[PDB]
From TrEMBL, chain A:
It is found in: Virion membrane; Host endoplasmic reticulum-Golgi intermediate compartment membrane; Host cell membrane. Homotrimer; each monomer consists of a S1 and a S2 subunit. The resulting peplomers protrude from the virus surface as spikes. This is Spike glycoprotein. The chain holds residues 740 to 743 of 1353 of the full protein. Fusion peptide 1 (FP1) and fusion peptide 2 (FP2) function cooperatively and have a membrane-ordering effect on lipid headgroups and shallow hydrophobic regions of target bilayers. They are considered as two domains of an extended, bipartite FP. The membrane-ordering activity is calcium-dependent and also dependent on correct folding, which is maintained by an internal disulfide bond in FP2. The cytoplasmic Cys-rich domain is palmitoylated. Spike glycoprotein is digested within host endosomes. Specific enzymatic cleavages in vivo yield mature proteins. The precursor is processed into S1 and S2 by host cell furin or another cellular protease to yield the mature S1 and S2 proteins. Additionally, a second cleavage leads to the release of a fusion peptide after viral attachment to host cell receptor. Spike protein S2: mediates fusion of the virion and cellular membranes by acting as a class I viral fusion protein. Under the current model, the protein has at least three conformational states: pre-fusion native state, pre-hairpin intermediate state, and post-fusion hairpin state. During viral and target cell membrane fusion, the coiled coil regions (heptad repeats) assume a trimer-of-hairpins structure, positioning the fusion peptide in close proximity to the C-terminal region of the ectodomain. Spike protein S2': Acts as a viral fusion peptide which is unmasked following S2 cleavage occurring upon virus endocytosis. Belongs to the betacoronaviruses spike protein family. It comes from Middle East respiratory syndrome-related coronavirus (MERS-CoV).
TrEMBL record, chain F:
The gene is S. The chain holds residues 753 to 788 of 1353 of the full protein. This is Spike protein S2. It comes from Middle East respiratory syndrome-related coronavirus (MERS-CoV). It comes from the Viruses.
């Protein structure tokens, strides 16, 4: 899922 | 060099009328599909002005009103909205080979 | 804001060499070749030659190869044309012009000087 | 004439369910196996590292085969040269001969496991179904055969040319036949001869390539090496 | 285990030796080795248990397509033919150059006049263009 | 917190396609802006 | 056994990489590598595991 | 280790000073001793710029  | 000729020697039209110029070449001007054809406009008391190039019917100093057409030995110029400030001598130009000769031209007129 | 200034007209007597000039303005003069044209009538125009302003290379119309030469004053941003042995058949409006490429590989005459004339 | 070689680049990837391989979930051996549970942990880690290295060698190789630019591939490529290597616009006629002559078992993945199952022929004898008894797993290849075909079509389109200096920047984009004549002049054959013999050269070249249709036998050493790469993988699992 | 590792290190050291005597001590024409951008100077430094190399490289961008010719010849004299050295003959697209053809580098686009420094004489070939007038090498 | 993983296809970067031409001249691809 | 084979394949892949960047992408002047007849264009195709 | 860290540093400083350049043919005998920037320009002309 899209980066932290 | 390629001899260029044009017809009719002059053309007269009503205002807002479509108008065209036919231009013939003694030999084709296409080399590598480049075409090398330029059209010019001139009025008394001033230098000729560039209008179009065979792939530029807008730009090269003009509105989309001046449409070049054709390939090989046959070319034409097409203006759908003629106005009285379009009365000018017009000239086909060969850029393909030296001397780079060009036609004697034709004159647009408003009736 | 590009302009092509030119020298005044003159009624030169035959057999005299004639020098004509055109000065560029509003652009770097050395990046464009100069074109020269002769006009004797509204329907009679012909190419004279072309001059690179950076390398000095030229091409000429075959009829003027023994009569015309061209030079540049890079500090005056100006180009010159000289024509040997004037005759009455040379009366014309002379025009300098700036080379351009609106279309890929198609030479275009672009801006023109207002013209000058010789008789 | 033509010569051929096979250069292996990968090992089939395998993992093992170490708990399942040692015992089948009987509870007595599960209790006993816990005393040795750290051996299986070492086994799994070692195989995992080996498989990661196989994936990296593949990606590194494909990063260099790619060309930044190429000609499109069309039929009639090479003019009078026959060019049977062209894709059947796919893989290629030569790749199909090579894969069909090879005796390797049909791949899993799709449908895979349902060819282990009773919903299929009684004649299956695949070691691939035996993977689901023994706890083996053969991992799928990293690239997908379609992308692999695309990478080698890019190499075919980079030909014509490699000359004219550099070739690490500009792309010549000239006919294949023209690049051949430059290569022939690059080995000391004079240009005068090359222009006189152009049709003769094309015919001799085509005869050399025509022999490739008969080249796939075990008497061809390069082919034999392909066959034994397959045999080594099968034997390790058996 | 130590015997196996020792052998692989020795082979790896042989590879390092070859790169120092090619990629560090000279420009390389190979491609392949080093970064994928031709080759220009490379450097090497110490690292634990080995050498660490850095390779400067050249990466092209903003590619354009142009018309080009295999070579040029005099139409008046079929035995005079030239071909570019380490570059290409392209149709001119530059306002500075009056000449119909121009020379450019093989790694970078920039037109220049065709002169004898950029050409070599070659045997005539059917694909060479016929120049009806102006070529400087030979002038005639 | 973050959501679900996304299935995706591995991209294939296509090479620049230079048109093949016949006859006495040819199309040439050349860079205009090198970078180190 | 797998660790040994994996290593030899990696080294073999390095050889393949060099041939693509010499023998496929260029004419070679080196003799001894390719068929023994100078060099002229070479081609490469996919094969099982290589 | 066999070499000591200092001698290793000396060996790679010698490589740094051999650059500029390996051109001008050979370079297995004579040493050009030219500025680094000059050797870069020769390398750039060696790739067709
Ligand atoms: C050839 O020269 C022309 C003009 O010198 C270049 O045309 C320019 O192209 C860029 C690209 O987007 C435009 O932003 C400019 O507006 C154009 N200038 C003019 C005056 O039209 C052209 O890029 C050059 N090269 C090629 C390969 O055509
Ligand atoms: C050489 O080119 C010819 C066509 O010019 C091809 O040979 C034919 O290929 C088709 C397709 O498989 C077959 O159906 C024909 O039977 C083939 N004819 C012959 C005489 O073999 C093919 O591209 C090349 N053939 C060879 C032998 O190199
Ligand atoms: C430039 O002119 C020469 C002629 O001097 C052309 O040479 C041709 O060469 C082929 C050899 O493959 C002959 O078969 C032809 O008969 C030649 N043509 C003529 C008209 O003699 C050469 O092709 C010309 N270049 C181009 C691009 O046409
Ligand atoms: C020449 O290439 C450089 C890249 O080396 C480009 O400059 C960069 O362009 C990107 C475009 O998105 C910018 O985000 C960067 O800020 C630019 N500068 C850098 C990386 O220093 C550009 O394409 C070209 N630059 C020119 C023509 O001046
Ligand atoms: C290439 O040139 C030949 C010469 O006759 C012609 O027959 C052929 O159609 C040309 N190719 C294309 C794609 O137009």
């Amino acid at each position: 899922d899209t980066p932290s | 060099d390629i001899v260029l000729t044009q017809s009719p020697a002059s053309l007269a039209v009503s205002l807002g009328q479509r108008a065209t110029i036919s231009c013939r070449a003694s030999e084709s001007v296409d080399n590598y599909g480049i075409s090398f054809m330029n059209w010019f406009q001139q009025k008394p008391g001033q230098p000729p002005k560039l209008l179009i190039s065979a792939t530029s019917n807008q730009g090269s100093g003009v509105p989309a009103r001046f449409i070049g057409s054709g390939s090989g030995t046959d070319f034409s110029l097409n203006i759908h909205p003629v106005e009285e400030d379009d009365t000018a001598m017009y000239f086909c130009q060969q850029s393909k080979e030296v001397p780079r000769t060009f036609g004697g031209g034709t004159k647009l007129e408003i009736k | 804001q590009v302009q092509l200034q030119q020298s005044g007209p003159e009624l030169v007597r035959p057999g005299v060499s004639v020098k004509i000039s055109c000065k560029g303005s509003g652009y770097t003069f050395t990046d464009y070749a100069i074109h020269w044209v002769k006009q004797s009538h509204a329907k009679s125009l012909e190419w004279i030659g072309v001059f690179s302003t950076y390398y000095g290379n030229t091409n000429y119309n075959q009829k003027f190869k023994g009569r015309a030469t061209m030079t540049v004053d890079k500090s005056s941003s100006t180009a010159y044309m000289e024509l040997a042995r004037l005759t009455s058949e040379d009366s014309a409006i002379y025009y300098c012009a700036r080379k351009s490429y609106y279309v890929d590989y198609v030479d275009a005459m672009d801006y023109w000087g207002q013209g000058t004339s010789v008789t | 004439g033509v010569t051929q070689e096979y250069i292996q680049t990968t090992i089939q990837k395998v993992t093992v369910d170490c708990k399942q391989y040692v015992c089948n979930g009987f509870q007595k051996c599960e209790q006993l196996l816990r005393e040795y549970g750290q051996f299986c942990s070492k086994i799994n880690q070692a195989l995992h590292g080996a498989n990661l290295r196989q994936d990296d060698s593949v990606r590194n190789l494909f990063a260099s085969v790619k060309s930044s630019q190429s000609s499109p591939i069309i039929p009639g490529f090479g003019g009078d040269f026959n060019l049977t290597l062209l894709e059947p616009v796919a893989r290629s006629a030569i790749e199909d001969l090579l894969f069909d002559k090879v005796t390797i078992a049909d791949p899993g993945y799709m449908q895979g496991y349902d060819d282990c199952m009773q919903q299929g022929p009684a004649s299956a004898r695949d070691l691939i179904c035996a993977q689901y008894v023994a706890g083996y797993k053969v991992l799928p290849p990293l690239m997908d055969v379609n992308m692999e075909a695309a990478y080698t079509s890019s190499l075919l389109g980079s030909i014509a040319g490699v000359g004219w200096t550099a070739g690490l920047s500009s792309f010549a984009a000239i006919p294949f036949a023209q690049s051949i004549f430059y290569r022939l002049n690059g080995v000391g054959i004079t240009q005068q001869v090359l222009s006189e013999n152009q049709k003769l050269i094309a015919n001799k070249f085509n005869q050399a390539l025509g022999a490739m249709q008969t080249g796939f036998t075990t008497t061809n050493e390069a082919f034999h090496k392909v066959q034994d790469a397959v045999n080594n993988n099968a034997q390790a699992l058996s | 285990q130590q015997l196996v590792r020792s052998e692989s290190a020795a082979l790896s050291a042989q590879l390092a030796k070859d790169k120092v005597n090619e990629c560090v001590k000279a420009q390389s024409k190979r491609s392949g080795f080093c970064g994928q951008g031709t080759h220009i100077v490379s450097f090497v430094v110490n690292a634990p248990n080995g050498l660490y190399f850095m390779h400067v490289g050249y990466y092209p961008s903003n590619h354009i397509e142009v018309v080009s010719a295999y070579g040029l010849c005099d139409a008046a004299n079929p035995t005079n033919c030239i071909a570019p050295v380490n570059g290409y003959f392209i149709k001119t697209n530059n306002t500075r150059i009056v000449d119909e053809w121009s020379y450019t580098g093989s790694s970078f686009y920039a037109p220049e006049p065709i002169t004898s420094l950029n050409t070599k004489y070659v045997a005539p070939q059917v694909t060479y263009q016929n120049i009806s007038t102006n070529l400087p090498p030979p002038l005639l | 917190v973050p959501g679900e993983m996304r299935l995706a296809s591995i991209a294939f970067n296509h090479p620049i396609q230079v048109d093949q031409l016949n006859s006495s001249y040819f199309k040439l691809s050349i860079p205009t802006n090198f970078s180190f």
